[PDB]
Amino acid sequence: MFENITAAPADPILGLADLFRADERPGKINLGIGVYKDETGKTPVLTSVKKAEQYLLENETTKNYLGIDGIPEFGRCTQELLFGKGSALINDKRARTAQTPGGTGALRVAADFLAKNTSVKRVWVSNPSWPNHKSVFNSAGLEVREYAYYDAENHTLDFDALINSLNEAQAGDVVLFHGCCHNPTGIDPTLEQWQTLAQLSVEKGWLPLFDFAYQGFARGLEEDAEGLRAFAAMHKELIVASSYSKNFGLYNERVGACTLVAADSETVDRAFSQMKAAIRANYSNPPAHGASVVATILSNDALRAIWEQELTDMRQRIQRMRQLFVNTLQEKGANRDFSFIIKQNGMFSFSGLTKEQVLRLREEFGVYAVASGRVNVAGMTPDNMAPLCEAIVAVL
Amino acid sequence: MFENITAAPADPILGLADLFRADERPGKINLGIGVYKDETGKTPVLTSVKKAEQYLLENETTKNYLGIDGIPEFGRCTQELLFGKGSALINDKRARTAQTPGGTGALRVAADFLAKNTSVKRVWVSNPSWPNHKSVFNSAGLEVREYAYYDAENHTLDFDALINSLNEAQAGDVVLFHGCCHNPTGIDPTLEQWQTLAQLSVEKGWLPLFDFAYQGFARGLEEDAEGLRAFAAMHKELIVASSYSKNFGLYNERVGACTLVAADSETVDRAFSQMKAAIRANYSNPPAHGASVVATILSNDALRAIWEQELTDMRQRIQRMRQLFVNTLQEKGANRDFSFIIKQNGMFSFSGLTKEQVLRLREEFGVYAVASGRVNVAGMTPDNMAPLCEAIVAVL
Ligand SMILES: Cc1ncc(COP(=O)(O)O)c(CN[C@@](C)(CC(=O)O)C(=O)O)c1O
Ligand SMILES: Cc1ncc(COP(=O)(O)O)c(CN[C@@](C)(CC(=O)O)C(=O)O)c1O
């Protein structure tokens, strides 16, 4: 019954992984996937984490099942990370958080929830976009259509075009926004541009679904949740699929949350009970480690304090690597002015390199970008910036 | 948009748990969920586990993403756990393992794979069965019909009504077997009976799906994989959804696997590549901790040795809790003969108690069993073995 099965095509992002872990060449550089790297090119375990792990280690008396939605204070700490301490969504008890296996697993369960207790049929995810939004949504029933986003010619956010294409969505449709650090492109909207969409989506009756996987990597933390917070004030319902894989360097422990906001307690209560059932039929309850760790660090002022410093380093290690990239680009003799790279936010940068350029790089040169020409700045190092900038500069 | 959403019914199993927590009566007992307990009544973190967590804390330099299918060694170790040291599925490369969030996640990943890469439209689960087999498959699309199993007058399993009801399953249908420790009831097929079913499904053209979540709790790790092995000898394609949450006491860390065996390497490879695609859109990759542990303990002969002893203890304590349950019952005032509780295997016993009886217990004596009258033996201790057995007897 399997004789018939087609060999699925390689994941555009996770394929590189293997493709790299096989290029036997010496100075092979991996600019693919979006995982941090320090000056040495390692993705280390955060210090606050190590400490939270020490604590747990000695303070854990059991491994007995979490709840369907996970660790309570993990949710509460998550909400305040999202909305903000005082916050009426919190003070009115409108939000309900389930802890999930990844921000990628927060998306799916929102989806399976939506497509099964809701009237939706379509979900709108920008162009371009993180290629797995499509797949997690189709896997749920839902069909995905695109809205205009990026002005490629001039490397920015084509707002008119964004707005005009959204106007063709229907009331009751779910429209997906990235909270900050647009993947790829890293072009995000201004606070102003965020309020507008907030107001529009209220008039047009769309249901905003936020993919929030990089709080803290562009600007700040309570500053990354700004757009998200402009919608919350206006709307009556929303869904945030949060992730703590990057900002807590917890990639393989799988930590994220699915926040469901509704008009009121009893409703969100009632709705949330369905979301729970949707998870129960997926993975049952969430993996305790990574979240026990995040709640601990966020629960403890010493650790939390350490943690915010550790993240503020990661962030700035990047803002730096942006500059150095363009600068070495020029001094190494490029034509295309790449100054736009500095305008972007997060681990990536839409390079503007042809698909066949990015193919030559992986072959003539060992350099590994995503086929969109997306490069992980956070994997560029003062030591590899030179061999890299020569490759890139040798294929233009 | 959520205004219309209906509140989901509480999980028959997982909602007893909320029921029990909110219960204020002091001498309250909880035979609900299937989580192991010790003489004192705690769900301790096994020793070899703390020892491995210590190794990890020390030796792990990173949190970087595991691959879609997770940790290799975990996989290779799981296969010898299921199949054998040098079983032909292993030396032939017929099998491929994916690390998944729990055994309820290996089940779902399989359902999504089947209902998308095969023609399967229905899955046959026994009567009775763990109530989430349905909810899981139905979420994949698949329809579940149900085969006879439990002969309730004589608390045995009539192979006949089981065979007969199955004769109706078509060829290309999925048949779901419990590797050992049937849930609930705890009745299992002899080896003879297992090979007869091995052969049957070989003729009738079924694709057996095995839910293996209690390896080691009936007789032993090998004596418990006999059925799965009689099958494995005969079939060309198989799917095993194994779990490590009980026998490694790793409940909230979510550790299990989805093993995919097919006729040859290229097939399984091809098939598996699509099973990977199905995981990529659920949770993306699996949570590292508990799998890291299991790999660690399983690939370290000392730790292994500790582990096997800790498992042998659990297993025997329950065995001890069974007869003590009979005997006490047996002369704490009972009339109904429950000696069959001893025939059963694993954490639970199918008490054959009126679902109105199981209501009186919980409401009049704080004793908590599931509405089927499934009681958790591994939650019975010498200390509560008397008030419990006094409750039962008051309501029968
Ligand atoms: C925009 C975006 N949203 C959500 C997720 C979900 O992440 P999580 O399950 O790991 O929480 C990612 C991860 N995407 C990465 C960083 C890796 C990937 O390809 O999955 C990326 O390279 O874009 C992401 O990039
Ligand atoms: C028959 C059966 N299959 C698979 C699983 C999956 O467990 P995992 O995801 O945790 O690996 C369980 C757990 N079922 C329990 C022990 C608990 C539950 O209801 O979830 C039960 O009480 O039967 C099980 O009982």
Residues with their C more than 2.5 Å from the N of the next written residue in chain B, i.e. before a break, are: none
Dihedral of alpha carbons A208, A213, A214, A215, sign: positive
Give the count of beta carbons closer than 10 Å to the beta carbon of residue B33: 20
As a whole number of angstroms, the distance between CA B119 and CA A15 comes to 28
Q: Domain A45-315 falls in which CATH fold?
A: Aspartate Aminotransferase; domain 2 (3.40.640)
Partner-chain contact B280 A11, CB within 8 Å: yes
- The residues pairing with B349 across neighbouring beta strands, listed in sequence order, are B375
CA of A279 to the centre of ligand 2 (A): 14
Name residue A204's amino acid: K
A190 touches chain B (CB under 8 A): no
The rounded distance, in Å, linking the Cα atoms of A279 and B132 is 11
Provide the resolution (angstroms): 2.6
How many CB atoms lie under 10 A from the CB of residue B226?
Answer: 18
Dist. CA A111–CA A298, nearest whole Å: 28
Q: How far apart are CA A35 and CA B30, in angstroms?
A: 44
- For ligand 1, whether the C-beta of A211 sits within 6 Å is yes
Q: Binding site: what residues of B are annotated?
A: 34, 130, 183, 374
Query: CA B123, CA B162: separation in Å to the nearest integer?
Result: 15
- Quick one: DSSP state of residue A30? B
Q: Which residue of chain B comes nearest to A275, CA vs CA?
A: B8
Q: Is A34 annotated as a binding residue?
A: yes
Report d(CA A338, CA A352) in Å as an integer: 9
Backbone φ and ψ of A304, nearest 5°: -50, -45
Q: Where in chain A is the domain with CATH 3.40.640.10?
A: 45-315
Residue B66, min C-alpha distance to chain A (Å) = 6
| Bridge partners of residue B207, in order along the sequence | B174
- The residue count of chain A comes to 396
Contacts of B390 (CB under 8 A, 6+ apart): B332, B333
Do A335 and A396 touch, CB atoms closer than 8 A? yes
Mutation site, A275, A283, A285, A294, interface B, largest B CB count within 10 A: A283
Query: In chain A, which residues fall in CATH 3.90.1150.10?
Result: 11-44+316-396
Output b/e per residue, A336-356; b: 16+ Cβ within 10 A: eebebbeebbbbbbbbbbeee
DSSP notation for B74-136: HHHHHHHHHT-TT-HHHHHT-EEEEEESSHHHHHHHHHHHHHHHS---EEEEEES--THHHHH
Give the CA count within 13 Å in the CB-facing half-sphere of B323.
4
CA of B196 to the centre of ligand 2 (A): 27
Element (H, E) at A55: helix A47-59
Cβ A5–B57 below 8 Å, yes or no?
no
Q: What is the DSSP letter of A316?
A: H
Nearest beta carbon to residue B45 from set A60, A254, A267 = A60
> Which of the following CATH numbers is that of domain B11-44+316-396: 3.40.50.720, 3.30.1050.10, 3.90.1150.10, 3.30.1490.20?
3.90.1150.10
Active site residue B211: yes
Q: Is B270 on the interface with A (CB under 8 A)?
A: yes
Query: Which of the following is catalytic: B112, B173, B188, B211?
Result: B211
Contacts of A387 (CB under 8 A, 6+ apart): A27, A29
CB of A9 closer than 8 Å to CB of A346? no
Residue with tokens 């060694």: B73
> What is the rounded distance in angstroms from the CA atom of residue A301 to the CA atom of residue A152?
44
Q: A155 is written with which tokens?
A: 């490397």
- What is the spatial distance between Cα A226 and Cα A224, in angstroms, rounded to a whole number? 5
This entry's atomic model was obtained through X-ray
Of residues A67, A135, A267, nearest to B2 (C-beta): A267
Binding-site annotation, residues of B for L-aspartate: 34, 130, 183, 374
Q: Which of A169, A48, A111 is nearest to B63 (CA)?
A: A48
Residue B269, class by beta-carbon neighbours within 10 Å (0-12 exposed, 13-18 middle, 19+ buried)? middle
Q: Which residues fall within 8 angstroms of residue A301, CB to CB, at 6 or more apart?
A: none
Q: Which residue of A has its CA nearest to B281?
A: A136
* Closest C-alpha to B295, from B131, B96, B55, B83: B55
Chain A residues lying within 8 Å of B117, measured CB to CB: 2, 5-6
Q: A106 to chain B, minimum CA–CA distance in Å?
A: 8
Regarding the beta carbon of A34 and ligand 1, being less than 6 Å apart is answered yes
All residues at 6 or more sequence positions from A115 whose CB lies less than 8 Å from its CB, including other chains: A140, A141, A142
CA distance A386 to A391: 9
The dihedral formed by the CA atoms of A279, A280, A281 and A285, expressed in degrees to the nearest 10: 80
Cite the DSSP H helix spans in A223-343. 226-234, 265-280, 289-299, 301-331
Question: Does residue A25 contact residue A231 with C-beta atoms inside 8 Å?
Answer: no
Whether the CB-CB separation of A282 and A267 falls below 8 Å is answered with no
Q: Which of residues 34-63 of B touch A (CB under 8 A)?
A: 35, 42-45, 49-50, 53-54, 57, 60-63
Q: What are phi and psi of B70, to 5 degrees?
A: 80, -145
Report d(CA B136, CA B142) in Å as an integer. 9
Give the helix/strand (H/E) hosting B259: strand B256-261
H/E stretch holding B199 reads helix B191-203
Q: Do residues B97 and A97 make contact, with C-beta atoms less than 8 angstroms apart?
A: no
Q: What is the DSSP string of A321-368?
A: HHHHHHHHHHHTT-SS--GGGGT--SSEEE----TTHHHHHHHHS--B
Q: What is the C-alpha separation between A262 and A260, in angstroms, rounded?
A: 7
- The protein residue with its alpha carbon nearest to ligand 1, atom 21, reads A34
Cα-flanking dihedrals φ and ψ of residue A225, to 5°?
A: -85, 10
For A253, the closest of B17, B57, B287 (CB atoms) is: B287
Pairing of the two strands A207-212 and A174-178: parallel
Range B140-147 contact pairs with CB under 8 angstroms and sequence separation of 24 or more: B140/B108, B140/B111, B140/B112, B140/B114, B140/B115, B140/B116, B141/B115, B142/B111, B142/B114, B142/B115, B142/B174, B145/B169, B147/B175
How many Å apart are CA B285 and CA A35, to the nearest integer? 14
Measured CA distances, A269 to A90, A95, A113, A282 (Å) = 13, 9, 14, 20
* A255: closest chain B residue by CA: B287
Instruction: Give strand pairing partners of A241.
Output: A211, A258
Q: Which residue has the tokens 């790829």?
A: A184
What DSSP line would sit under A97-126, residue for residue?
EEEESSSHHHHHHHHHHHHHHS---EEEE-
CA B63 to chain centre: 29
Separation of alpha carbons B382 and B301, rounded Å: 34
Chain A and chain B share a number of CB contacts under 8 A equal to: 240
Rounded Cα distance between B368 and B374, Å, is: 10
Task: State the pairing for strand pair B174-178/B122-127.
Answer: parallel
Our measurement of the distance from residue B206's CA atom to the centroid of its chain's CA atoms, rounded to an integer in Å, reads 21
- Pick from B116, B45, B87: which is nearest to B314 by CA? B45
